[PDB]
Design a protein around this nucleic acid. Structure first.
Ligand SMILES: [Mg+2]
Lengths: 89, 43, 274
RNA sequence: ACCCUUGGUCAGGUUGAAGAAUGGAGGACCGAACCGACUUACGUUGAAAAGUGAGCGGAUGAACUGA
RNA sequence: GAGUAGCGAAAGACGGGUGAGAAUCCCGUCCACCGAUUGACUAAGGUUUCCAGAGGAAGGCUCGUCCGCUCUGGGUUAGUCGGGUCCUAAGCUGAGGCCGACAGGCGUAGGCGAUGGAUAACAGGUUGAUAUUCCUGUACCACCUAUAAUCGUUUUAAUCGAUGGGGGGACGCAGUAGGAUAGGCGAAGCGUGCGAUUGGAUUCACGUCUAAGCAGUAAGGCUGAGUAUUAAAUCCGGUACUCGUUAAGGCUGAGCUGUGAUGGGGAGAAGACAUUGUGUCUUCGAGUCGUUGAUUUCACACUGCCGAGAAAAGCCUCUAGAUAGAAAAUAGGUGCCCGUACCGCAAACCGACACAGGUAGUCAAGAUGAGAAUUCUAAGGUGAGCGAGCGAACUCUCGUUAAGGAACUCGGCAAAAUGACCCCGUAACUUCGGGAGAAGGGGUGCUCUUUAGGGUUAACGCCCAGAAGAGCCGCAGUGAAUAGGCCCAAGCGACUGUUUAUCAAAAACACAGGUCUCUGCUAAACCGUAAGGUGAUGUAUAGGGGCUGACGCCUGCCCGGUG
């Protein structure tokens, strides 16, 4: 726990623009709440977060060849830490 | 003209749906036949 | 009294309504009002059992004590009010030490008269007392059938029974119809006739005014099809082509006595009527 | 189809009941929204498995509509 | 069948560019259509159709470089918005229980369930896609911790309180009024223009700002609530006095502001630079007056009516109890799950389709008007997924027609004609309401003179209406659009209403009114095997059934037969 919920970071032009500010973006597990993400990040990176925002993305249709499928459901959290710097190197 | 099937998620899942078929024995039947048939959408 | 509308419209020619003069307060009480959700002929299953019943103006129930059981404590008539559930009116009464409850309005109850329930109560329009203490010849309303259950007989606008005599544990009473029944002496009545004596003289006029009390149209039986009614069918208008007029469900309707025999009330009815 | 609970809608003008002015009654009048389907023409392998155009009827009520 | 029918309502033209290819894609100019909407929102429903690159097989009724298509990568951020969280209606479930051949049905306590009640965030900026969600500004509601300026037997208190009692929430329909308010419309400020077609030079745009926090309050409601008194309550449900109906204004209600915040974000802005190929950045910019004003808000307020118009919780007091504690004037922190893209009178929804149908609600400007009618237009969208010719027959839609005017025809079907507003007139017949807009006549343009009126007012000025004259012009003056043909007489049904969705809307059905009959209340009648219900929490002035069907005059004779 506190490491199993941060699945991956999110890198993209909008995430990059957020990183211009102190907002960092992560791909978190689908069964967590804002408080738990705050705790986990401030536990790992030793940062002090000010706020965090969560959103749930629906499974998207993806056809691979002749077989249709669905992508996995996603839950994304945005942190806006004050002091500190999650480095994604 | 107003045709039939004015869709509605709530009523669709109320009149039909897993818990509604699990409320009556006859409801339990159709799930039984649908599994015997190997159906993928049971309710 | 009755007000006769002027024929300003056809749908309103012969209309008549109650002047509502006897009504002194035009609003109810929040604590003696409970909800009445209209059922419209439908039963525990959800099927139409009685017909000609449907949508109508909402109505709040005005709980009253037909069982005039507060004994000895006097009560003042505060306001005679309109009640939508009943042909008659109701009168708020305040008891001599704080409680207030509704009753049925007698013919001449005027705001300010006192009302006494009990057994040592006087014989005055409104006071309730048991039938062992009601003189022979008195007009009585709200006559209880079983000791304590409450008034069940004579309660609609202009209902009055006359105490005609005394047997042993039963008093003889000529009910509104004409039956001379025997009601146990330990049962209560109320002295006087029930008001709104002009309720029976009103004319409705509008189809819609009849379709505001919760009545729905009733379809004369002689025009339904043979599969809907016994009088149905025929090419053209037809007479009743049966030995007797019949009912929707197949049971004679112009004369057949439908009172269950072997009832435990047969020993108590001296002469019948209706 | 009917009903139960809870909501919503009805531009604008006219008439002038009960209680000369006053008053504001009506399944009252004319008429848009809305609802309907009377006549006609078109359509009839249709734009449509019942519609469209032109007129037409109710339009504060036994109204119409949502959940 | 045949290269035939069809290509699914409509306005396109042209210059430039892109490409293997262009009526069909991109940009521009002009033109045209909608504009109580083809415009902006928001629901239901659909789920990724949303955005940026790229492609062109297929799908687009043609083409296609294009797209709601294909490939790649992206996009939905909430303590306050809507839900969960709080409450409950109709219904649905229902422990025990009642009834039931099994199955199971019913039902109490209790739960679930909004379409309702209660609940704390506003403005501006912002990208290709989100924003009461992000950021800037300023707030508010709960909760916790530290501290407290002394509240003070911790029974009572600074004050803690039920799951109980009471109050409240808390509600219909229709009328008018009234106060300000968004709008819109004229002129002070501000702005930028002053013209190459004759002429003119007091010759188009802007014109502002919230929640919060107080200060005030405009219709608008109520006082005896008066001390003391009657599993209990000394706030409330019932009683008795003084100041007494004061409005002094005591009380509870509740679209409203000068000097400040306001020499400040936004300051419809032309002013400003190296440029943000000049497409930009500083930093600089007016908010005034006085008219009309709601279908909005006070507010179901007030008044009237009969058809007599939810519940529960939040909330407030009050006790039963519970307890040595924090309120007070601060300062720090904490606030979770779900929905958020996109379409939503629609090519993303229900109609098999990029279908001429259906799809609840909110905002809805100017000119004309009474109007949300009608014609043109603003904000803003759009030119309809086939075209180019020729203008035969014949169909369809539309306009006009000499003389006659129903001679057509089963029938004036269709078409034609009246239509608005103002004035004058209006019959028979009537249930005295009506008939009735009956019928039938006349006028409406424009300019000038004149001069009543009332509306805001300090007045100028601004609105909205009158009357009498004198002219002028056309064929025509409600010069377009929109807006009753009428009358005489017979049946039928009293009337408004409802019916065969999809060949019949009527004389058929309803109806108000009559009458007969049944029914005494565990009523009759009805649904169920029963339990349970409906009737009805109704009681013979009530309920069920049969017949007839406003209203007026009447409703004869027969009881042999059957019931
Ligand atoms: Mg509709």
């Amino acid at each position: 726990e506190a490491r199993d919920i941060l699945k991956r970071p999110v890198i993209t032009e909008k995430s990059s623009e957020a990183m211009a500010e102190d907002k960092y973006t992560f791909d978190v597990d689908t069964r967590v709440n804002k408080t738990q993400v705050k705790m986990a990040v401030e536990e790992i990176f030793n940062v002090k977060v000010a706020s965090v925002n969560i959103m749930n993305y629906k499974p998207k249709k993806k056809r691979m060849g002749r077989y249709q499928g669905y992508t996995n459901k996603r839950r994304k959290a945005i942190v806006t830490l004050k002091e500190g710097s999650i480095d994604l190197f | 003209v107003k045709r039939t099937y004015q869709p509605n998620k709530r009523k669709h899942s109320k009149v039909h749906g897993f818990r509604k078929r699990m409320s009556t024995k006859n409801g339990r039947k159709v799930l039984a036949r649908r599994r015997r048939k190997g159906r993928k959408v049971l309710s | 009294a009755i007000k006769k509308y002027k024929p300003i419209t056809n749908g309103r020619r012969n209309m008549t309504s109650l002047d509502f003069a006897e009504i002194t307060k035009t609003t109810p009480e929040k604590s003696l009002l409970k909800p009445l959700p209209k059922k419209a002929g439908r039963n525990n299953q959800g099927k139409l059992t009685v017909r000609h019943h449907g949508g109508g103006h909402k109505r709040q129930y005005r709980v009253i004590d037909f069982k005039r059981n507060k004994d000895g404590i006097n009560a003042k008539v505060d306001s005679i009010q309109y009640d939508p559930n009943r042909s008659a009116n109701i009168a708020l009464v305040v008891y001599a030490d704080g409680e207030k409850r509704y009753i049925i309005a007698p013919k001449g109850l005027e705001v300010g008269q006192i009302v006494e329930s009990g057994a040592e109560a006087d014989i005055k329009v409104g006071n309730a007392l048991p039938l062992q203490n009601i003189p022979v010849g008195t007009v009585v309303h709200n006559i209880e059938l079983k000791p304590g259950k409450g008034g069940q007989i004579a309660r609609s606008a202009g209902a009055s029974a006359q105490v005609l005599g005394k047997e042993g544990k039963y008093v003889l009473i000529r009910l509104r119809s004409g039956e001379v029944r025997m009601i146990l002496s330990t049962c209560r009545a109320t002295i006087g006739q029930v008001g709104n004596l002009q309720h029976e003289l009103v004319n409705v006029g509008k189809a819609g005014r009849s379709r505001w009390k919760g009545i729905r149209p009733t379809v004369r039986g002689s025009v339904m099809n043979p599969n809907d009614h016994p009088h149905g069918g025929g090419e053209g208008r037809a007479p009743i082509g049966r030995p007797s007029p019949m009912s929707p469900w197949g049971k004679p309707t112009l004369g057949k006595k439908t009172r269950r025999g072997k009832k435990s009330s047969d020993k108590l009815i001296v002469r019948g009527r209706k």
